């Protein structure tokens, strides 16, 4: 029939998403996650919709930057697959805890 080689569609998806701007996390599950996290600090908290939007924007930006640094670390290790140790190294160097 027809089947593309491994990694061709990966590059195609890289070009499509690095070219677009739309948010890559589903909005409703993220809203639920935010609410359930904030439930641990004060009960019965309401949120402006734009507050959750700002939180999602910030989280996606943070994760994209983190994935860039993870990919750099992985390439530095002569690998192509990113691994959790790459994430741990990137956050360790970045100064996060």
């Amino acid at each position: 029939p027809h089947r593309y080689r491994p990694g061709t569609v990966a590059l195609r998806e890289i070009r499509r998403y690095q070219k677009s701007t739309e948010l890559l996390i589903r909005k409703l599950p993220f809203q639920r996650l935010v609410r359930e996290i904030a439930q641990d600090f004060k009960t019965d908290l309401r949120f402006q919709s734009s507050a959750v939007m700002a939180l999602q924007e910030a989280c996606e930006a943070y994760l994209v930057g983190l994935f860039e640094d993870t990919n750099l670390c992985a390439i530095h290790a002569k690998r192509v697959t990113i691994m959790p140790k790459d994430i741990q190294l990137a956050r360790r160097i970045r100064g996060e805890r």
Partner: protein
């Protein structure tokens, strides 16, 4: 009565910047030339970014500037990138960039 911005040849509001400096508790007293200098600097930076963003928008056959264009303008200019380095732009995306290792031989 001609406004301070007109007398200094600027488009940013000198009187408003002076008011914000006074009502911002930066110091007890504010000199006359401080708001003029600050308005000139702000106008210059805004003009630079709007230049670059308009160029980027025209590069995409777009006649309006959107946050994506501002992000491309900022991230492509190295001194602007240094200035706005710790800043994330809503609906901005990232620069198209693929490591040469990941490309097929």
């Amino acid at each position: 009565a001609k406004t301070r911005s007109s007398r200094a040849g600027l488009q940013f509001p000198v009187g408003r910047v002076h008011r914000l400096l006074r009502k911002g508790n930066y110091s007890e007293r504010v000199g006359a030339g401080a708001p003029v200098y600050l308005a000139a600097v702000l106008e210059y930076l805004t003009a630079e970014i709007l230049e670059l963003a308009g160029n980027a928008a025209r590069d995409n056959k777009k006649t309006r500037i959107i946050p994506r264009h501002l992000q491309l303008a900022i991230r492509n200019d190295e001194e602007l990138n240094k200035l706005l380095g710790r800043v994330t732009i809503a609906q901005g995306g990232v620069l198209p960039n693929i490591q040469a290792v990941l490309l097929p031989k």
